[PDB]
């Protein structure tokens, strides 16, 4: 009684400053993207079969800046604050804000040739707490976290950490964007939102 | 009694501005390019065997800007207005306005090696309404659409959506151009135009 | 790039009067049921893989009344007005308003044993106009029909006709309900509703 | 040069009284049902490949009454007047006016499981006078019978006898209806009617 | 649930004048011939399995005149006006108004030997819009065409074009006649006409 | 070190009113039945191998009313309030309050023949949060739920929802009863209660 959905949509717009800026995002259907958020809502639980975040530049060979991203599994630990820490995560990847062109074949959804330039990272999945996770909202999670940091600890499978520094302007500069390419399993349907 | 034609010609000149600009183009022989327009006209119906739009840069590593394109099958839906929406289409592809050099082997018509940089998208074909479509003009279509948005809905197989933003000048800048590489099937000949 | 969904939800509440009452319902995702309506909306086109309407009684062995239902493929023809006509349709089925208990194994989604009592009918599917149909609303369809009865003719695959007579009261009596058990194919995602 | 047609339509509405009421019906295309009557008319001769009459209740578990039916091959013999006589026919069947639900799978046109409840009877076919019978009207037959009861004897293959008694009201009560499920062979086309 | 019918009846009387006269005829059951018109009406949809128009002379070796005929698939295009255009159609055939004797074996419905003289043309069938077409009347079609020339475009599979010139008298002369030899598939029965 | 227990006892008495009445019950050993409650208590954890709730009528063919039941896995979601919602659950089943006689072979614990009439539903088990659940009391659960609706979320595997409507009296009428037929796994024994 499992509905399997595989799709890739824009996940987030990226910009670079001269000072490091670490951002985090839960890896729930409700957040990987506007579309899935709506679809997945129609099911009470779900399970990631594969979740990949891929960065695609939109700037010039001239643009200063680097992007870093990786996954955190123990939602308990404080979110990284340095490239150093970030570099220790699983599936960590670093690249110049204008590189990553090659990752396209991941969003594209085709056969990948030379993906050595690619700035994409996939989820560990096997190292996840449980199999079926409940569909939750930022609000829902944000509230449960505000009780026992451990009560929330198992509502979302993992978080994606992103760090952007080495920029040229103190004012954000359009570097590119991340696209999530997921394959989800959804079970037990219910009422939308 | 099918005449098969495979050819690739220039499809459109591309330019980038700082504000997003979404453009659409029907995927009929009459529009993919000046040449096919004339040839295909000599046949009453046709069927796409394969239609691929490929972008080839003509700017510098220095040029700011990104190009996005994908296909729409339900000619009924409103044309995308954001990269986000556009990113949801089938065969969506995004790249820096100066990248895509590698796609050449598609226009070139040879053996493709590393096409991970490539900014090309091919038509779904199997998800098309019918098999044989009638040859129609922009004028012809534009008129039929101006009656029942559904009467036109099946005259053209699909539309190609293109979005160009992240530019540097408020005044269009020559970024590159798209080339359509089609393989068409034409049946029942008639009088030109 | 096809998302396959199989599910069964309540489709409609049934009631019987002494005078015949023929009702019709389009066989679009938007109408087979509240849930699918919402889900399927997230896709621009779809295709029925299997659509079965099953009636399940909720009345007594004592309840007078019979239910009749079948499918119409040429959306053009006037909707039946008599059991006689209705009896000519494909997959026509007739039964006592309190029978049909056995059809449960269709909603249930299990192995069916003795389904001779069953008041269920499945869609012909192979005799459908095209493969991929566009997602449309009652409103959308009702408007297009109000132009060329033929423009709408191909927006929905087929209609389900239902007739209820042989009742005991001139005032509707709760006889049972119909449940749609569909397996749909959805393609090209878009913005909800 | 044989056109084969298999279809099942409503054949007759049934009602029960307290006193026995025997009814007869010829087994010609012109009488098994409104539809076939029209279709078959377009052919000069025809041959039954299979003819089955099936009763489907529409009353309650509470309804008093029984239905009886069988076939007569020697159109010469006087039509039965008692259940006893009727019980001697080929394919005789008796059942409670509210039973027979299971016969549906015969009209339905599917795979039959438990058809022990079923109130259906099929034609002997092999024991028929000739192979090809001429298409005739009630009027046509009624006139030829009014000459030599033997001249008509070979215009129709057989007659269906039906007896309804054990009712509760002296005034007919809606018990159910019979549906003919035929497979006919038609030859030598001519002008309709 | 498909009823297959194969039959051949007179389709039209032919006559020749000295000036060219192009005639067209839709390829619907309602028009290929009086008989099928009536029969096929009893079904809501149908599909041509094979449709062949054959000309049989009835004039003398002395009769001046030629007949031309072919099929048009894009019901949209203007009907031919010259033998030249007509000659471009699929299955075009030309012959002397008194030739074609050999085509008989097509109406006859037997084994064909030397059919090189034959003035017959068969329908392309595989190049048809859809599979199942709705049964429509000249009136029905003529009305729908009088709205969106495209709304009618898919109600009939194709049209047969016929041109008669090279005659000897300014007043039509009996040259022969065309006979349609069809094999149709009919589905979903309904009420005649 | 696993003790396996398979048994079936009465789970609950059912009654019908004219207004819908939705009831819920946790699927813990402590609630499926008086007996298991006591036995299972002697073990600290347990795991459902199979849990089936079966309804058995005790009323007449004359009794008005229908029963509906299904499972909820995301203990978080609000309990259904309509047959419609309820109909969306996994293993949903609906039947007339006097039907379900056939389900007996489930309680009986024998070979099942024709279980198409059966009003029984089994637990999904594979879609459960974890494997080993702790033995908890209504009180224990009711208290933990009264803190973080998520802290309780994983103490019980799933809940059974039941809806009874279409009744004849505003005052509950004895319709039948549900019997749970479980196969449990118990580990790590401790002190009773």
From TrEMBL, chains A, B, C, D, E, F:
<dbReference type="GO" id="GO:0005198">
    <property type="term" value="F:structural molecule activity"/>
</dbReference>
<feature type="binding site">
    <location>
        <position position="77"/>
    </location>
    <ligand>
        <name>Ca(2+)</name>
    </ligand>
</feature>
<keyword id="KW-0167">Capsid protein</keyword>
<dbReference type="GO" id="GO:0039617">
    <property type="term" value="C:T=3 icosahedral viral capsid"/>
</dbReference>
<keyword id="KW-0946">Virion</keyword>
<comment type="similarity">
    <text>Belongs to the icosahedral plant coat protein family.</text>
</comment>
<protein>
    <recommendedName>
        <fullName>Capsid protein</fullName>
    </recommendedName>
</protein>
<feature type="binding site">
    <location>
        <position position="74"/>
    </location>
    <ligand>
        <name>Ca(2+)</name>
    </ligand>
</feature>
<feature type="disulfide bond">
    <location>
        <begin position="105"/>
        <end position="112"/>
    </location>
</feature>
<keyword id="KW-0106">Calcium</keyword>
<dbReference type="GO" id="GO:0046872">
    <property type="term" value="F:metal ion binding"/>
</dbReference>
<feature type="domain" description="Icosahedral viral capsid protein S">
    <location>
        <begin position="1"/>
        <end position="191"/>
    </location>
</feature>
<keyword id="KW-1142">T=3 icosahedral capsid protein</keyword>
<feature type="binding site">
    <location>
        <position position="135"/>
    </location>
    <ligand>
        <name>Ca(2+)</name>
    </ligand>
</feature>
<keyword id="KW-0479">Metal-binding</keyword>
